[PDB]
């Protein structure tokens, strides 16, 4: 009995949404408003921008219009664009995919075989993805019901070139007016005082070589042995080995202001990692007759080892991947390198027991240990019980009827966190000699020219502090209680459940920063404190049929949760860290619950800001800050709980629909009545809320209140943020309720009789989107808002596949 | 089975017991030199010109006030916030400096001095470095930790307070460190990375005089000079001293700004960067990676005001217009005007740093402003552009070492100290001044030709060694550091100890404000702008064991 499975897949994918940026148009007027509210002459921009404008019979300022000349620039090298720099670096998406396995089984031994393809042009331009797969798995029976041993084999081959490090977030602050190519069509850039940052577009085009090579091959193989009846272990082995390999090509360039001189470079890099597992487990059984067991005891060792090296080279005379090797350098030169490793062993256990399939238990201890940890805490033990009760069964609520099943859970389950930074419990100390790039400065090197010779040669080195050590760190440990009711209604089409968990951690690992003083490398992973994590969840669904054959399914989901942070070391509450922002510790809250000031909108009137509380920076336009003190003045003990990460409710819904051959399946999630916070509004509602000036901004900034627009939310436009606007406030916080359509796929199914026709058993087209619609709530700024740190969605996915299977 | 989970070793580390074996320790201790040329950034120079645009000296620079928007609010006093990054950051970093100081003491102390004959010598120079980084942290804030118990555990860090010393008592710690280093340091360093023992002096006498300018009560202003903090400043600043050394003046201002003469007699103490020495770029000095010419592409920071412009003119007697020098601003052809400017200020119609083929003009290629911060130059932190020296990684720099302690400033302080005793010795206060003065007049060398090719007609003249008034000899030894010390961010810090910082600052801001736009809004606030604040991400994270500046809270 030979099984072939075929698939295929294309997919688009199209970003449907960002955001809206500044025009070239738009970004003058923004720069005028902020110029002539401040009462600075809107002319002596340093743009370039030409002004006409002039007031409005009430008296304030109004722009008449916008000239720019047809290149920014004193030599005409560089033109003015009305640049979609999103849209430049933008691309639709297409996936393409192929599977094709083979199954051979006997009653003797079995062999399956796959083979698949995916590739994937990515929605940036000028990065791509693709990767074959083939899979080998078989077993061999070398007695009759006694004895097999087994294999499983997946290999892997992948090539991908990927983004730089927010392009598109560059490709957002980078002024429309900036060409993407100058005049005589090379690549163009900034000039004079328009912010230093690279186009994107060039950016994208540099790194289009830079591509790298993934390989993998895991599986394990084993031998389980029966001895007698109802009894058998089995040992396994497997391994997990991938190897990366790029060249990363620095080229030279020079547009505009942003230079390079004229530097060229390749670096080689390498990286290596090696997982490998050996286990061995013993299962007994029993059943007489009205009676059921399962013990099972077993043991498995892991180890993981990886290491990564490079070399770099600089001063190509030929600016190509084909010469540009590290031998046909003729510059300077570096190298890098590295490993680090960890393992694990885990003793453990398992029971299972039964009635008259009534009362049930099961009772699971383990024993774990980490090359994490020092040896004196090293291991650490979990139990778990849980009991449950299929109460139909019972021989008096018989009658009953309408009802088909009911059983009632109940877990007790301790749990383990190991994950942390494989040296931990260490304090570090590292020879940065300063071999290594660094943005601005801040190399943090060893070495230093001890004898005043400007160099010309190695200089001395030292150590430096990378953490300090906990030699007393430990284990995290989750005790989640759980409890719930499985049930089954009117001929088993009402269906659901009914849970309610507990999880308790205790001795929680995050690595804490240093206080100030303690200076450098003063960072160490500590245990602090336990958190709370208790809720509901709800499950229910109808299926049905009709008449005119319609089969359908709707199943529903209800969650909600409360969480609280029971305890933290003084030292950790007082510097945020888990919440409140260093002006509030955060037990008894929220984890993640933040703390700022509370904003009460824009004064409108010299008199609103005089019958208000002492404000720095307030004047009309500016945003009003209340006075929680009620103390006359705003200083920095005026401020509240005002962010709260957890949902009132959460709630799913998946719907399913056959007619007519067709299949229809839908799948909407969605929660309501959740905080979010964001910094995205830095970027849409000021012109001076960031570090450097003159990148692009949002579009609703352009709906600044002024004189000539009151009644707006948004406050003034001003060149230097005089309000502290900034701050941690109310207007940072907005309402994130939503729902969205997931998934939703139509399929049809040839009927059987005409698929045979052409010989095959199951043939199967579809078509499907991810990421379809959203729904936001009205007091969003938008951009997806369950990533709202985010300026832009996730992308959309649409599918078109079959499914054959002969 | 546990013979399993010790088999793998932290790879590439020494991890903490090791660090303190000895053979480690000569690293430790360049480590601790190291760090103050390769620990600063951009906007957080450990040269302090980022802080010093308060003064009356320059202008923040670069595209307008909406780009490094923190430092304009600085540059005005107005919209400073006690948790602007800028500030939490140069505590932050200044701190990291102490740490490796720290460490190198935490093993030096623990060592043979049979096996190391040079014990003291290499902890004079870790508590010298000590010294250094709580100066500046005094400087900028008042109320500092005093992070001084090489053997502090990483607990004890959590209890530490900066109210535990008074602001006498702090001031004397920072003293303490300096004194040892003289009393253990040696008359030359054949490396000159090294301070000398007068190098340790002068900056035993620095501290002792802003230490003498009392701010003994609980706000900034003066509560009285202390003499004997003077006397100090006298003593450690004796010519004996400095001729044990080899230091003095240049023969030529210039020079103490030009890569080909990096280290000369006048250099006390440098931070020593370097190119071609094995690191990814160069040990450069990042530091001034804003202040470099726009002609460069970026990003034209730190322009020096006019108000530092004019304060170069001279009467027709050679002196400096005391009373009347920014009525007009300078004027090439008509005024005679101090040498000194041309080393500081490139001004337009000029060369760049002596290279005439670069000449400084009024356009996008030398203001990145269009003019909104002016169209001047620093000089000091910056090279010629054919400087074999210059490098572009993220932003431009040179290996031009950064001083911090100019001979000058040795003379200038002990004139200081002088005029402050009234002990008669105020002519000897004088005739300091004038060597100082004298050199700046025939330092013509670079510039000779600059009368015929541009018709400036240089005038400085030395004051007569007469009687002068103790309110008179301060006039003119605040002027000779007004135009000894232009752009080196000194200027602020000095009204701060002279306390004059609201009365001098203020009246900046009404004159200048006709000739930056930037200045209009703007305006000092005594009893709580003479320093920054202390970093609320810091008093947040201490648990009540901070305590605010005055007129912070
Ligand atoms: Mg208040
Ligand atoms: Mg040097
Ligand atoms: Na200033």
Redesign the interface.
Request: charged content about 20%; hydrophobic content about 25%.
């Given at each position: 009995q030979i099984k072939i499975n075929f698939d295929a897949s294309v997919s688009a994918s199209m970003y449907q949404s960002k955001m809206n940026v500044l025009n070239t148009e738009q970004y003058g007027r923004a720069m005028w408003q902020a110029y002539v509210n401040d009462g600075e002459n809107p002319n002596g921009n340093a743009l370039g921008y030409a002004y006409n404008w002039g007031y409005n019979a009430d008296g304030n300022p109004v722009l008449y219009g916008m000239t720019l000349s047809k290149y920014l620039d004193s030599k005409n090298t560089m033109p003015v664009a009305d640049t979609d720099w999103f849209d430049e670096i933008t691309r639709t998406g297409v996936i393409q995919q192929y599977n094709l396995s083979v199954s051979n089984g006997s009653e003797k031994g079995s062999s399956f075989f796959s083979l698949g393809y995916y590739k994937n042009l990515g929605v940036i331009k000028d990065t791509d993805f693709d990767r074959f797969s083939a899979r080998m798995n078989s077993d061999y029976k070398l007695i009759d019901d006694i004895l097999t041993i087994g294999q499983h084999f997946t290999l892997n081959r992948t090539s991908e070139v990927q983004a730089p490090g927010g392009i598109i977030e560059t490709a957002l602050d980078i002024p429309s007016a900036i060409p993407v190519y100058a005049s005589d069509g090379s690549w163009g850039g900034p000039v004079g005082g328009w912010p230093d940052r690279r186009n994107p577009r060039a950016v994208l085009e540099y790194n289009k070589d830079n591509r790298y090579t993934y390989w993998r091959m895991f599986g394990d193989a084993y031998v389980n042995l029966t001895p007698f009846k109802g009894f058998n272990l089995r040992s396994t082995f497997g391994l997990d080995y991938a190897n990366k390999q790029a060249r990363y090509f620095t080229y030279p360039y020079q547009e505009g202001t942003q230079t390079n001189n004229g530097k060229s470079a390749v670096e080689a890099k390498q990286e290596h990692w090696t997982k490998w597992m050996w286990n061995a487990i013993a299962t007994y059984q029993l059943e007489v007759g009205k009676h059921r067991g399962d013990v099972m005891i077993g043991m498995e060792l892991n180890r993981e080892d990886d290491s990564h090296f490079s070399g770099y080279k600089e001063d190509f005379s030929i600016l190509t991947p084909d010469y540009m090797w590290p031998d046909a350098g003729s510059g300077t030169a570096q190298a890098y390198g590295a490993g680090e490793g960890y393992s694990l062993v885990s003793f453990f256990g398992k029971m299972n027991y039964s009635y008259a399939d009534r009362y049930l238990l099961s009772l699971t201890l383990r024993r774990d240990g980490s090359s994490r940890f020092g040896k004196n805490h090293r291991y650490a033990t979990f139990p778990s019980v849980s009991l449950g009760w299929r109460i139909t069964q019972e021989n008096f609520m018989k009658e009953l009827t309408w009802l088909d099943d009911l059983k009632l859970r109940a877990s007790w389950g301790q749990t383990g966190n190991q994950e942390i930074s494989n040296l931990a419990r260490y304090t570090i100390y590292a020879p940065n000699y300063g071999t290594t790039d660094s943005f601005g400065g801040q190399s943090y090197g060893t070495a230093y020219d001890i004898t005043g010779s400007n160099g010309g040669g190695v200089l001395p080195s030292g150590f430096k502090r990378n953490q300090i050590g906990n030699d007393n760190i430990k284990w995290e440990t989750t005790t989640q209680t759980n409890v719930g009711i499985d049930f089954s209604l009117f001929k088993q089409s009402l269906y659901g459940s009914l849970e309610y968990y507990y999880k308790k951690a205790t001795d929680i690992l995050t690595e804490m920063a240093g206080v100030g003083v303690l200076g450098e490398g003063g960072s160490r992973w500590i245990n602090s404190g336990a958190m709370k994590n208790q809720g509901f969840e709800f499950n229910l669904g109808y299926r049905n049929k009709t008449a005119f054959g319609l089969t359908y399914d709707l199943n529903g989901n209800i969650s909600t949760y409360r969480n609280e942070i029971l305890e933290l070391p003084e030292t950790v509450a007082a510097n945020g860290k888990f919440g409140g922002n260093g002006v509030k510790s955060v037990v008894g809250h929220t984890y993640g619950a933040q703390v700022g000031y509370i904003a009460d909108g824009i004064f409108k009137s010299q008199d609103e800001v005089d019958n208000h509380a002492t404000q720095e920076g307030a004047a009309v336009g500016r945003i009003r800050y209340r006075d929680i003190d009620h103390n006359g003045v705003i200083d920095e003990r005026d401020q509240n709980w005002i962010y709260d990460p957890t949902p009132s409710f959460s709630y799913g819904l998946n719907i399913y629909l056959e007619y007519k051959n067709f299949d229809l399946t839908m799948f909407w999630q969605g929660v309501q009545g959740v905080d979010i916070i964001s910094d995205v509004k830095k970027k849409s509602d000021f012109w001076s809320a960031s570090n450097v000036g003159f990148l692009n901004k949002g579009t609703r900034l352009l709906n600044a209140w002024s004189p000539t627009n009151p009644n707006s939310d948004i406050p003034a436009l001003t060149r230097s943020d005089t309000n502290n606007e900034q701050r941690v406030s109310t207007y940072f916080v907005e309402n994130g309720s939503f729902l969205k359509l997931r998934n939703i796929q139509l399929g049809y199914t040839v009927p059987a009789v005409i698929s045979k026709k052409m010989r095959m058993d199951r043939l199967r087209f579809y078509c499907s989107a991810q990421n379809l619609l959203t729904i936001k709530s009205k007091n969003f700024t938008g951009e997806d808002p369950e990533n709202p740190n985010f300026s832009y969605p996730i992308p959309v996915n649409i599918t078109f596949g079959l499914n054959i299977g002969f | 089975?546990?013979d399993?989970?010790?088999?793998?070793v932290?790879?590439?580390?020494?991890?903490?017991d090791?660090?303190a074996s000895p053979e480690?320790v000569?690293?430790?201790?360049?480590?601790?030199?190291?760090?103050?040329?390769?620990?600063?950034?951009?906007?957080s120079s450990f040269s302090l010109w980022n802080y010093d645009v308060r003064s009356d000296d320059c202008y923040k620079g670069?595209?307008?006030?909406?780009?490094?928007?923190?430092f304009?609010?600085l540059e005005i006093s107005?919209?400073i916030?006690?948790?602007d990054w800028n500030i939490?950051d140069i505590?932050?970093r200044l701190?990291?400096?102490?740490?490796?100081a720290?460490?190198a003491l935490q093993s030096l102390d623990q060592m043979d001095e049979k096996t190391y004959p040079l014990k003291n010598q290499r902890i004079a120079e870790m508590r010298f470095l000590r010294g250094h980084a709580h100066f500046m942290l005094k400087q900028l804030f008042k109320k500092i930790?005093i992070?001084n118990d090489e053997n502090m555990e990483?607990d004890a860090?959590?209890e530490?307070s900066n109210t535990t010393y008074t602001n006498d008592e702090q001031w004397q710690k920072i003293a303490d460190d300096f004194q040892f280093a003289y009393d253990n340091l040696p008359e030359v360093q054949i490396?000159?990375?090294?301070p000398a023992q007068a190098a340790a002096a002068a900056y035993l006498a620095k501290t002792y005089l802003y230490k003498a300018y009392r701010q003994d009560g609980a706000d900034n202003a003066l509560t009285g000079i202390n003499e004997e903090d003077l006397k100090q400043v006298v003593k450690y600043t004796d010519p004996l001293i400095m001729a044990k050394g080899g230091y003095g003046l240049e023969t030529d201002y210039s020079m103490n700004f030009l890569?080909q003469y990096?280290?000369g007699a006048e250099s006390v103490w440098?931070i020593?960067?370097?190119?071609?020495?094995?690191?990814?770029?160069?040990?450069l000095n990042?530091?001034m990676?804003l202040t470099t010419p726009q002609i460069?592409?970026?990003?034209d920071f730190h322009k020096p005001s006019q108000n530092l412009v004019n304060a170069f003119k001279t009467d027709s007697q050679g002196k400096p217009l005391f009373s009347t020098y920014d009525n007009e601003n300078y004027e090439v052809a008509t005024d005679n005007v101090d040498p000194r400017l041309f080393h500081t200020v490139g001004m337009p119609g000029f060369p760049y740093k002596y290279n005439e083929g670069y000449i400084i003009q009024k356009?996008?290629?030398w203001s990145?402003?269009?003019?909104?911060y002016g169209y001047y130059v620093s000089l000091k932190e910056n090279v010629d552009p054919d400087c074999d020296?210059l490098?572009?990684?993220?932003?431009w720099?040179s290996?031009l070492?950064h001083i911090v302690i100019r001979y000058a400033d040795v003379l200038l302080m002990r004139a200081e100290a002088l005029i402050q005793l009234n002990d008669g010795r105020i002519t000897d206060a004088i005739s300091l001044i004038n060597e100082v003065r004298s050199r700046a007049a025939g330092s013509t060398m670079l510039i000779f030709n600059y009368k015929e090719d541009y018709g400036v007609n240089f005038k400085v003249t030395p004051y007569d060694l007469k009687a002068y008034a103790q309110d008179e000899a301060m006039k003119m030894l605040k002027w000779e550091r007004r135009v000894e010390f232009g752009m080196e961010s000194s200027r602020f810090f000095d009204l701060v100890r002279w306390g004059e910082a609201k009365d001098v600052i203020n009246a900046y801001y009404v004159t200048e404000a006709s000739r930056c736009?930037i200045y209009?809004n703007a305006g000092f606030t005594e009893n709580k702008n003479e320093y920054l604040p202390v970093?609320?991400?810091?008093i947040?994270?201490?648990?009540?064991n901070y305590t605010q500046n005055f007129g912070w809270?």
């Open positions: - | 089975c546990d399993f989970l010790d088999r793998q932290p790879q590439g580390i020494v991890t903490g090791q660090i480690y000569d690293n430790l201790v360049i480590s601790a030199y190291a760090i103050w040329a390769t620990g600063d950034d951009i906007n670069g595209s307008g006030t909406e780009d490094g928007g923190v304009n609010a107005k919209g916030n006690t948790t939490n505590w932050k701190y990291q400096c102490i740490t490796r720290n460490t930790v992070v990483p860090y959590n530490l490396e000159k990375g090294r890569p990096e280290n440098a020593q960067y370097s190119i071609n020495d094995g690191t990814y770029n160069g040990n990042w530091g990676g460069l592409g970026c990003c356009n996008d290629d990145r402003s269009k003019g909104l020296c490098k572009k990684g993220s932003y720099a290996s070492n736009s209009k970093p609320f991400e810091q947040s994270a201490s648990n009540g809270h």
